[PDB]
Amino acid sequence: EWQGLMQFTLPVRLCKEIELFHFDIGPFENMWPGIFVYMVHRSCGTSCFELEKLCRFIMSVKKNYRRVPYHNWKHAVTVAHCMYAILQNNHTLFTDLERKGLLIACLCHDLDHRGFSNSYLQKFDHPLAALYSTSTMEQHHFSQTVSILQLEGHNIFSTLSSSEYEQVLEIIRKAIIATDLALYFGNRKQLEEMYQTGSLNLNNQSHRDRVIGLMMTACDLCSVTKLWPVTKLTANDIYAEFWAEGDEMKKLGIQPIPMMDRDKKDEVPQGQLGFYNAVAIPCYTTLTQILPPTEPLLKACRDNLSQWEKVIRGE
Ligand SMILES: O=c1c(OCCN2CCn3c2nc2ccccc23)cn(CC2CC2)nc1-c1ccnn1-c1ccccc1
Ligand SMILES: [Mg+2]
Ligand SMILES: [Zn+2]
C-alpha cells in the first residue's frame, strides 16, 4: 500500500485545478493519499520529508480514520487541501516549519473520530471525557497523531532538531485544538478587535496562533466553500452524523436538539442559513480581512448561502 504511494504521480490535468480553493477531491478517492503527498512536496519541498517515512505515516493516518459518515478520511484530505490553498496564496507569511506542521495538523485534526461531539461524550461520561475534560475529541485527535508518529518508520520529523521538533508539535497541538468550534467564537472576536484597532501583529507569536486557529476553522468548515453540487452532498454527510448522535440519545429515551433530530429534517435549509450567517460568513470575512488572498473562500461561501436562501424560498 505505502510502497505504491511512493510510485504515485498526480495527473497533469489536475495540476492547475488543485491550486483552486473550490477544488473538490470527491471524484479522486484512490488519489487522496498521493494528492496529499503532492501538496506537501509543492508547499514544503521534496527535500522536506523522507519519502518512505511520509508514505507510511499517511497510510496509518488513513486507516485511523473510522468509517463514519462525515468525520472521515475524505474530510481529513479536504481540510488538508484548503490549508494547502491558503498557504499557496500567502507564500511569504508562513515559516518553513509552520507549513509542514499545518498540513500534517489538518490531515490528523480529526484522527479516530467516532462521529460524536464533545457534548455527547461529556454528557454520557465517555472515557475520553473522563480523560480530556474540555476539547475532548481534539485532544484525542492530537493524542492519536503523536501515537502514529511514535510508530517505527513513521517519525517524519526525525530530521529536525530537538528544538524544531518541540516547536512543530506545539504548532500541530494548537492547530488541532483550535479546530474545536467552541473555541472559534472567542478567537474570531479577539482577531476582529485587533483588526479594527490595528493592533494585529504577525510578529507576535500569540497573534500568529490566533490567525492559524482561524485558518484551521476555515479549512475545517471549507465544505461551505465548494461549488453548490459538492456543498449540498457534503451537507448530507454532516447531518447523517448529527442524526446518528441524536439516534443514540433517542435510544436512552432522551430527546435530542432539533439539529440532531432526524424528525426535524425539514428545517435543515434554515439550519444551514443560520449557521452560514452566525458562523461561516464571519469566519471567512475575518480571514479575508487578515489574509486578502483567501477572498475566494468568502465569495464561495456567499454563493452557497444564497443557494440555501433559494432552497428556503423554493427556487
Ligand atoms: O453544517 C454545520 C451545522 O449545521 C447545523 C446548523 N443547524 C443549527 C440548528 N439546526 C441546524 N440544522 C438544523 C436542522 C433542523 C433543526 C435545527 C437545525 C452546524 N455546525 C456546528 C455544529 C455544532 C457543531 N457545523 C456545521 C459544519 C459545516 C461544515 N462543517 N461543519 C461541522 C463542523 C463541526 C462538526 C460537524 C460539522
Ligand atoms: Mg473535529
Ligand atoms: Zn474537522
Angle of the 136-149 helix axis to the 162-177 helix axis, nearest 10: 150
User: Closest by alpha carbon to 51, among 64, 32, 38?
Assistant: 38
Query: Can you give the chain as a three-state secondary structure string?
Result: CHHHHHHCCCCHHHCCHHHCCCCCCCCCHHHHHHHHHHHHHHHHCCCCCCHHHHHHHHHHHHHCCCCCCCCCHHHHHHHHHHHHHHHHCCCCCCCHHHHHHHHHHHHHCCCCCCCCCHHHHHHCCCHHHHHCCCCHHHHHHHHHHHHHHCCCCCCCCCCCCHHHHHHHHHHHHHHHHCCCHHHHHHHHHHHHHHHHHCCCCCCCHHHHHHHHHHHHHHHHCHHHHCCHHHHHHHHHHHHHHHHHHHHHHHCCCCCCCCCCCHHHHHHHHHHHHHHHHHHHHHHHHHHHHHCHHHHHHHHHHHHHHHHHHHHHHCC
- What's the rounded Cα separation, in Å, for the pair 78 and 306? 23
- What's the rounded Cα separation, in Å, for the pair 52 and 34? 13
Domain that holds residue 52: 1-315
Distance of CA 144 to the CA centre of its chain: 16
Q: 219 CB less than 6 Å from ligand 1?
A: no
CATH number at residue 49: 1.10.1300.10
Structure-determination approach: X-ray
**Lookup result for grid cell 483567501:** 294
Resolution in units of Å? 2.4
Cell of 179: 479546530
Query: Dihedral (C-alpha) 206, 210, 213, 214: value to the nearest 10 degrees?
Result: -170
Structurally, the chain folds into a number of domains equal to 1
User: Closest by alpha carbon to 103, among 86, 91, 127, 89?
Assistant: 86
Cell of 192: 476582529
Q: 234 CB less than 6 Å from ligand 1?
A: no
- What's the rounded Cα separation, in Å, for the pair 222 and 73? 15
Cα 261 to ligand 3 centroid, rounded to whole Å: 21
Which residues are known binding-site members for 3',5'-cyclic GMP? 71, 272
